[PDB]
Scaffold this motif. Structure first.
Motif, PDB file in Angstrom:
ATOM      1  N   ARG A   1       0.763  -1.251   0.000  1.00 24.93           N
ATOM      2  CA  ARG A   1       0.000   0.000   0.000  1.00 24.93           C
ATOM      3  C   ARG A   1       0.789   1.292   0.000  1.00 24.93           C
ATOM      4  O   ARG A   1       0.758   2.053  -0.972  1.00 24.93           O
ATOM      5  CB  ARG A   1      -0.992   0.003   1.169  1.00 24.93           C
ATOM      6  N   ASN A   2       1.454   1.572   1.101  1.00 23.22           N
ATOM      7  CA  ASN A   2       2.146   2.856   1.255  1.00 23.22           C
ATOM      8  C   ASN A   2       3.648   2.698   1.006  1.00 23.22           C
ATOM      9  O   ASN A   2       4.441   3.615   1.259  1.00 23.22           O
ATOM     10  CB  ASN A   2       1.866   3.394   2.664  1.00 23.22           C
ATOM     11  N   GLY A   3       4.021   1.537   0.488  1.00 18.59           N
ATOM     12  CA  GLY A   3       5.397   1.264   0.087  1.00 18.59           C
ATOM     13  C   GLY A   3       6.209   0.381   1.010  1.00 18.59           C
ATOM     14  O   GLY A   3       7.337   0.064   0.714  1.00 18.59           O
ATOM     15  N   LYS A   4       5.635  -0.074   2.127  1.00 19.53           N
ATOM     16  CA  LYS A   4       6.400  -0.974   3.001  1.00 19.53           C
ATOM     17  C   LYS A   4       6.765  -2.243   2.246  1.00 19.53           C
ATOM     18  O   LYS A   4       5.916  -2.815   1.577  1.00 19.53           O
ATOM     19  CB  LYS A   4       5.572  -1.316   4.254  1.00 19.53           C
ATOM     20  N   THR A   5       8.034  -2.650   2.332  1.00 21.55           N
ATOM     21  CA  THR A   5       8.522  -3.818   1.614  1.00 21.55           C
ATOM     22  C   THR A   5       8.487  -5.031   2.523  1.00 21.55           C
ATOM     23  O   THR A   5       8.755  -4.917   3.718  1.00 21.55           O
ATOM     24  CB  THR A   5       9.967  -3.598   1.073  1.00 21.55           C
ATOM     25  N   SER A   6       8.163  -6.190   1.956  1.00 19.87           N
ATOM     26  CA  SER A   6       8.018  -7.405   2.756  1.00 19.87           C
ATOM     27  C   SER A   6       9.338  -8.159   2.924  1.00 19.87           C
ATOM     28  O   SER A   6       9.432  -9.094   3.739  1.00 19.87           O
ATOM     29  CB  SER A   6       6.966  -8.319   2.144  1.00 19.87           C
TER      30      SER A   6
END
Length: 162
Positions: free
Chosen positions: A147-152
């Protein structure tokens, strides 16, 4: 004629492959040189070891904060944030390399690799290059975003150069 640079991309330290880029030194020489030199490491600092800290599907992969690794840092090779060089090139599709910034005339070292035609950035972000080889790797990177750019997973530039 334009120079080519590459990133070896890794995902939690495991190699994903090499992305190469054409830098449009023929149209935005100052902006191209900044990215080129940060990719080689020739000034003594730069992108090697840094990460893509924000990845937004349908929009971009953002990297280049090699000082704070989270978007708050980055620095150009010029000792100060530098002016928008020009808006000659537009955001025409996936693979475009364009500067990230904090508004007009605040270019440092952060950039987007676009994953779609991002025409909403035209006239506000300086386009300075494009993916040459490895666009599928950029598509793979995009899948680690949200969504807001958080990377997994941690997506890094394991090595880079000209």
């Amino acid at each position: 004629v334009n120079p080519t640079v590459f990133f070896d991309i890794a995902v939690d330290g495991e190699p994903l492959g090499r992305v190469s880029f054409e830098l449009f030194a023929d149209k935005v020489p100052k902006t191209a040189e900044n990215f080129r030199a940060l990719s080689t490491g020739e000034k003594g600092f730069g992108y090697k070891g840094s990460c893509f800290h924000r990845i937004i599907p349908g929009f971009m992969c953002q990297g280049g904060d090699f000082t704070r690794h989270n978007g708050t840092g980055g620095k150009s090779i010029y000792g100060e944030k530098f002016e928008d060089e020009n808006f000659i090139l537009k955001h025409t599709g996936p693979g475009i390399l364009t500067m990230a910034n904090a508004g007009p005339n605040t270019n440092g070292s952060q950039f987007f690799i676009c994953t779609a035609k991002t025409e909403w950035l035209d006239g506000k972000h300086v386009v300075f290059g494009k993916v040459k080889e490895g666009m599928n790797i950029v598509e793979a990177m995009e899948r680690f975003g949200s969504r807001n750019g958080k990377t997994s997973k941690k997506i890094t530039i394991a090595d880079c150069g000209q």
